[PDB]
Each structure stands twice: as structure tokens, then as C-alpha cells.
């Protein structure tokens, strides 16, 4: 019921996250921003180019093992 997601930043660095299919993705967003040392609202998180909301889940978005989330400046 868990999958690994690769979060890729503008500098091509990666942080991977193991998440549940049903978990709201706010916690991933907050954790990634924390590790970059920037406010969460300074970033936007995309899956297949579409914005990931705080209450989106991997299941809702159709995500699969080793799928990529891209992070851009807001």
C-alpha cells in the first residue's frame, strides 16, 4: 500500500519519499520544502505537469512506483 516517489528539483537533485497511496500529499510537500530550507508556499509541486494539491493522494492522481514529482518555484 506504499509507493516510492522521486521529487526532482530545478537543480536536478532528487529526494525520494515512501508514501501510502491514500495519504494526502501536503506532508510530502512540507517535508521537501523543509529539506530545501524554503517556505512551502515558495514552491509548486507537479505531477505530469499538473499541480498537486495539499489534499491530493497518489491514488487520486494515478501515481505508480518510482513516478516523478517535479518541483518548480511558485
Amino acid at each position: 500500500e506504499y509507493i516510492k516517489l522521486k521529487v526532482i528539483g530545478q537543480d536536478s537533485s532528487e529526494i525520494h519519499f515512501k508514501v501510502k497511496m491514500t495519504t494526502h500529499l501536503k506532508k510530502l510537500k512540507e517535508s521537501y520544502a523543509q529539506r530545501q530550507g524554503v517556505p512551502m508556499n515558495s514552491l509548486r509541486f507537479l505531477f505530469e505537469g499538473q499541480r498537486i494539491a495539499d489534499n491530493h493522494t497518489p491514488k487520486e492522481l494515478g501515481m505508480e512506483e518510482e513516478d516523478v514529482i517535479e518541483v518548480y518555484q511558485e
Binding site: 516510492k4 532528487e14 525520494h16 519519499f17 515512501k18 508514501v19 495519504t23 510530502l28
Partner: peptide, 10 residues
């Protein structure tokens, strides 16, 4: 300059 693997569990 190769980053190590980073996996965080939530």
C-alpha cells in the same frame, strides 16, 4: 559530486 540516495518515509 554524486549525491547519495535519499529516501524519507511518511
Amino acid at each position: 559530486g554524486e549525491a547519495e540516495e535519499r529516501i524519507i518515509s511518511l
